[PDB]
Design a protein around this nucleic acid. Structure first.
Ligand SMILES: [Mg+2]
Ligand SMILES: [Mg+2]
Lengths: 157, 158
DNA sequence: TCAAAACGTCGTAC
DNA sequence: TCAAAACGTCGTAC
DNA sequence: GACGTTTTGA
DNA sequence: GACGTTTTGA
């Protein structure tokens, strides 16, 4: 199978250098619990070399390619079912981001049960940990927010 | 064997994303012909995770790591005899930057003979071609500079 | 005279 | 009600 | 890179 | 990233 391991290792190298394994709390008004924990693997490259994200998509067999209005393209794999399959491909080779993976994999464990406020609360605390491994300072929605809101919908978390 | 090839594939993966396979013309005033063509593979990372550049050095067996003053670290392999050896490791796996690799290997071919003013000239012209690919155009110093100043040192190039 | 080691920093690809 | 597909953009790690 | 935002559609 | 520059030293 090792042709495939060469490609996964290569991709792991690329992700480690230029990717994004993430978990975010996004506001969703039509959700009962008001919040979703979005999980994603993302890879950036300038649109000039758009073709490589298409190659990554082929290697993985999952995920969407888009162009950005600023001259960048993104390859993206959202959602637990598809993203678990992918992370377990890259997990033996990831180095710099093995930690954001495992956490995200622990999050995906709970996504099926996330209608339950305590389970949602758990995924939200986990997202924050992933938030502390990303350079990003943009993180505005936290677990503190999900809990106050959950509190206020009259749920016991 | 197959383990080393997995590390070289990962590293190829890394260089394609945050590497720099380059060829610069640097002015060296103590040089007879005033110019040197520098070949280099460089990998960048935040000093936050300075450790990854030491992992890359160990895997390769060559290169220097430094801390920059602004919070980044670079791992760098300079020069023909050691940078050649690194390229042939990565070459089968470099996707994005294999052109820069192949050009730089054509340049390393002639560095031993770069005391010949026409040989330095074929080398400088290959430096600019690498440049049309490493697309951050902060370079002022081109082959036309070398050729013309070579002309004024009394040397016959074209 | 060569040329790597080590360096400082501005622009944009993330 | 869920949640991915698709999106726009500033800050900083390259 | 890492966010938040708007759209599609199950 | 991808330059140009100073330093060490063979
Ligand atoms: Mg990076
Ligand atoms: Mg890159």
């Amino acid at each position: 199978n090792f042709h495939d391991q060469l490609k996964f290792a290569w991709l792991a190298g690329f992700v480690d250098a230029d990717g994004c394994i993430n978990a975010q709390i996004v506001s969703r008004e039509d959700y009962l619990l008001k919040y979703q924990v979005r999980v994603s693997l993302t890879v950036f490259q300038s649109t000039t070399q758009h073709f490589i994200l298409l190659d990554i998509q082929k290697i993985l067999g999952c995920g969407t390619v888009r162009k950005r209005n600023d001259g960048m393209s993104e390859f993206c794999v959202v959602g637990g079912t598809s993203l678990q399959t992918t992370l377990e491909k890259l997990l033996p080779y990831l180095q710099l981001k093995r930690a954001q993976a495992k956490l995200v994999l622990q999050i995906i464990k709970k996504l099926p049960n996330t209608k339950d406020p305590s389970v949602l609360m758990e995924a939200a605390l986990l997202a924050d940990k992933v938030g502390l491994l990303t350079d990003g300072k943009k993180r505005t929605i936290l677990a503190e927010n999900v809990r106050e809101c959950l509190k206020k919908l009259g749920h016991v978390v």
